[PDB]
Write an enzyme that holds these catalytic residues in place. Structure first.
Site, PDB file in Angstrom:
ATOM      1  CB  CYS D  69      27.755   2.728 -29.601  1.00 59.63           C
ATOM      2  SG  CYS D  69      28.260   4.856 -29.112  1.00 59.63           S
ATOM      3  CG  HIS D 102      22.457  24.919 -38.942  1.00 59.94           C
ATOM      4  ND1 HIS D 102      22.594  25.757 -37.581  1.00 59.94           N
ATOM      5  CD2 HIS D 102      21.378  26.128 -39.688  1.00 59.94           C
ATOM      6  CE1 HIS D 102      21.778  26.685 -37.944  1.00 59.94           C
ATOM      7  NE2 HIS D 102      20.826  26.903 -38.683  1.00 59.94           N
TER       8      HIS D 102
END
Lengths: 149, 149, 149, 149
Positions: D69, D102
């Site tokens: 976007c 992570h």
């Protein structure tokens, strides 16, 4: 009151030069852009356009310069070789503000490959609208840059 | 062995020990030479810029690292020295391209703008990345050199 | 008065006092409520994300701020809470648009990525910027709400 | 071996969707993109495409999602509302690495208005190529995110 803003690119910046012209003209009533080239996708050498804009700015033929290559880095290296030029690589609002407020930068260097259009717009707007702080501690730093020229 | 001259101002001073450590993490061949400042006293970035830059240009050091608030004043001042190609970098990409295209010999960094893990990434990348060797970048770089006279 | 719940993990912990101070600089109406952690002990970001997020969603606080290494884990965890619109911001532009378009109620920040002056800019901007009020963003936001059931 | 990468946008991302498709296909031998829309400049609502990609990924119809976007923020808010989705806003190489290593992110959210094409390419390449760390301390964090769903 008219402040001419000279704009230079290479062939990597070329595809977005029209948007750069607009961002200038819409930044304030007095700013008027002059795009100096290049005029196609043919490969060219960024230092030729960097040096042409920087020399315009240094001679007072334009008040501010904008340079666009892939990263902005080559433009900032080349343009800074011209005496009287303080060319700032900016990539966000904060750097645009500091370039003006602390460094009194007169050329802003931008990366078409790195920074998206709304941020390029915001950088330009900010750079054109932000005044130099006028403060002694910054001015003494700028005099040391001018001594090194 | 590659000697890496490191300079800051008072704004970059508080992180200079992390910068020295990032240089040693880039590889065993890198020898950091931190040239100051050595306290929190307010100083003028160009004194330290020009000092690192002159070292690199004279061949007293192989690479430079300059840290101020944004990187911009360091890059403007360092680039005033002939033979210097000082790149303001703010991410992996710009660190790669400063080397690969601009054969940058000084990296300029912002302690106020760029967080510690990215500063580390940039330093490691800048030190480990070679120049691409392409003749079209070399000709560009020769044009910058010619503008220094 | 606007209550601003602030959470971190151990990675964000070392700068949390600067974050509290940036909130008070955004204006007198802002009351920071730092909810932990209160030491360097290793903790799990989602415990603190979900804690801030739940507070904001229940109306125990008006706005949230989450700080981890990159901002990403905080934004993923916070957004799992219904009523939450948590925005990872890294510059002025993103901080403006998170508010203006997304009416974001939690800002997520990276201590490892983003330098202190930009973190401060983002926090001030996030707190001071209103939602644009446009119906086309409102309909988007109603679609997000509908997906939470 | 084929890993389908579902790609969704709004009308602000639409103009660069072709480049996104390429960056995927060129990231590795096994990645194949599927662009789900939209198919014009007509204004549309980002959550509809966010939710369609995220649900594809959540059901195992695609292995990875990419959403584009203006800023990436709305996509990341919406996509994170789907259980089993970990949607990461990335703006550089470092965040792309951390999102995977992570957070084991399975959706990457990008801003056409903020981040330039070579950086968008690099983010995608990095996100698709970086493995999850596999470590217990990260996994325990991810289980807490899944409990909150």
């Amino acid at each position: 009151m008219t402040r001419k803003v000279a704009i230079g690119a290479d062939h990597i910046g070329f595809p977005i030069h029209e948007s750069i012209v607009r961002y200038v003209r819409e930044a304030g009533e007095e700013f008027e852009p002059v795009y100096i080239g290049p005029h196609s996708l043919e490969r060219v050498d960024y230092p030729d356009y960097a040096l042409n804009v920087a020399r315009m700015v240094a001679r007072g033929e334009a008040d501010v310069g904008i340079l666009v290559c892939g990263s902005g880095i080559g433009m900032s290296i080349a343009a800074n070789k011209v005496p009287g030029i303080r060319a700032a690589l900016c990539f966000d609002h904060y750097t645009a503000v500091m370039a003006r407020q602390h460094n009194d930068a007169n050329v802003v260097c931008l990366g078409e490959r790195t920074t998206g259009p709304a941020v390029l717009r915001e950088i330009i707007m900010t750079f054109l609208q932000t005044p130099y702080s006028g403060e002694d501690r910054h001015t003494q730093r700028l005099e040391k840059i001018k001594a090194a020229e």
